[PDB]
Every structure is written in C-alpha cells, then in structure tokens.
C-alpha cells in the first residue's frame, strides 16, 4: 500500500508546512503542476484543477490537509475515510451535493464496478482551439483511462468528439465524425455534476 | 509564486 502524495490549491507557505510534515511519514511526494498518478491528493478546497479532476477520474483519495496533520502527529498514515472530500456534505454550499461528493462517488463507483477509470472504453478526439494547449485535458482523460485518439491514429470506434465551441459548429462539420460532439465543459460535468 | 501556479480551473482556462 503506497502513499504517493500530491497537493492542489495551497499557497506556497501552506504547502511548505504540509510538505514538512511529510518528512515524518514514509511516502512519495511529487512536485508538479500536473497530475502524476498520486494515490492521495490533498486538496485545499473543491476545485477543477488538473490534479483534482484527474484524481476523481481515477478514483483516487482526495482528502483534507488534516489527513497529513493528523497522520504526522500519529506517526503513521491513518484511515482515509473521515478526511475524504465527500465524507460530509454541506447542505448550504456554493457547490452542489454532486460536486461535494464527487471524489467519494468515483472512488466507490470504480471499486464497485471494477473499471479502472471514469472514462474507460472512451475513444476521444479532441478538437481544442489551436491557440491553447490541450495537455491538461489529455492528462485528465488518460487518468480516467480514456483513449485519446491522435491525428495519426485511425478514427475507427471513436466515442466522443470533445470540441472547443462544439455548440457552434455546423452540422456539415460535425458530419466529418460518426461520434457526437461534446463541449469542453462536458468533461467536468460528467465527473462533478451529472447524475448517473 | 511562479513555482506554484497550477490552474484551479482548467475548464475555465479553455473557455476564455
Ligand atoms: Cl488506501
Ligand atoms: Cl506541487
Ligand atoms: Cl460549446
Ligand atoms: Mg480499480
């Protein structure tokens, strides 16, 4: 049982204090803006960072900073359950009940079904605006075990076209693909908001 | 800090 830690949403001084506490525990810490297959993501708040969405898509633990504080004080990694984002839902919140429960929902759902990710068996073509990088979107999709179809790969079996300005594109242009078009927001909504 | 500037909303970043 490994503890590969990443953090999202903390300012520098908060992150320094938390990483100092990791020296009391056997673990791996990965410093990167990118999702790097952490087993435990420590999140300052519910959010839509690459790390948060990717951790949801892979059914990882997404926990509060108290998980690190209390584990370090105990000298041992504790049970994650009561520290999970989703363990307790705030009925008066800017975040929907679905979004507040999303990390727990995906962790439990992937264990239930046996699937390795929220997007397993998806075969996705990305049509992202040419001025911006799709790289964070790709790493979230791949964290969920979607197959992102590169331009040099055959389009056989595409399931989703995810497109900048999907709602604007002409039917003639949508006709270049067998699969339906989805806006960029669909990815976040599928993980955080949609009732399955 | 430049060494701590991950986006907190990658969907928003792609919309505008
Ligand atoms: Cl565990
Ligand atoms: Cl980091
Ligand atoms: Cl759109
Ligand atoms: Mg599994």
Numbering used by the authors:
A (entry chain A): 6 to 201
B (entry chain C): 437 to 452
What does the study report here?
Rad18 interacts with the SMC5/6 localization factor 1 (SLF1) to recruit the SMC5/6 complex to DNA damage sites for repair. Previous studies have shown that the tandem BRCA1 C-Terminal (BRCT) domain repeat (tBRCT) at the SLF1 N-terminus (SLF1tBRCT) plays a critical role in the Rad18-SLF1 association. Our structure and biochemical studies demonstrate that SLF1tBRCT interacts with two phosphoserines and adjacent residues in Rad18 for high-affinity and specificity Rad18 recognition. We found that SLF1tBRCT utilizes mechanisms common among tBRCTs as well as unique ones for Rad18 binding, the latter include interactions with an α-helical structure in Rad18 that has not been observed in other tBRCT-bound ligand proteins.
Isothermal titration calorimetry (ITC) experiments indicated that SLF1tBRCT interacts strongly with a Rad18 peptide containing phosphorylated Ser442 and Ser444 (Rad18-2P), with a KD of 15 nM. The strong and specific Rad18-2P-SLF1tBRCT interaction enabled us to crystalize their complex and determine the structure to a resolution of 1.75 Å. Two SLF1tBRCT molecules were found in the asymmetric unit. Rad18 residues 437 to 452 and 436 to 451 were fitted into these densities on SLF1tBRCT molecules 1 and 2, respectively, revealing mostly identical structures for the two Rad18-2P peptides. The Rad18 peptide N-terminal half including the phosphoserines adopts an extended conformation and interacts with BRCT 1, its C-terminal half forms an α-helix and interacts primarily with BRCT 2. The Rad18-2P-SLF1tBRCT interface is the largest among tBRCT-ligand peptide structures reported to date, burying 1600 Å2 of surface area. Our structure revealed that phosphoserines 442 and 444 (pS442 and pS444) in Rad18 form distinct interactions with SLF1tBRCT. The pS442 side chain is completely buried at the Rad18-SLF1 interface. Its phosphate group forms polar interactions with the SLF1 Thr13 and Lys56 side chains and the Gly14 main chain carbonyl. In contrast, the pS444 side chain is mostly exposed to solvent. Its phosphate group forms polar interactions with the SLF1 Arg50 side chain in complex 2 in the crystal. The α-helix is stabilized by the pS444-Arg448 interaction and a Ser443-Asp449 hydrogen bond.
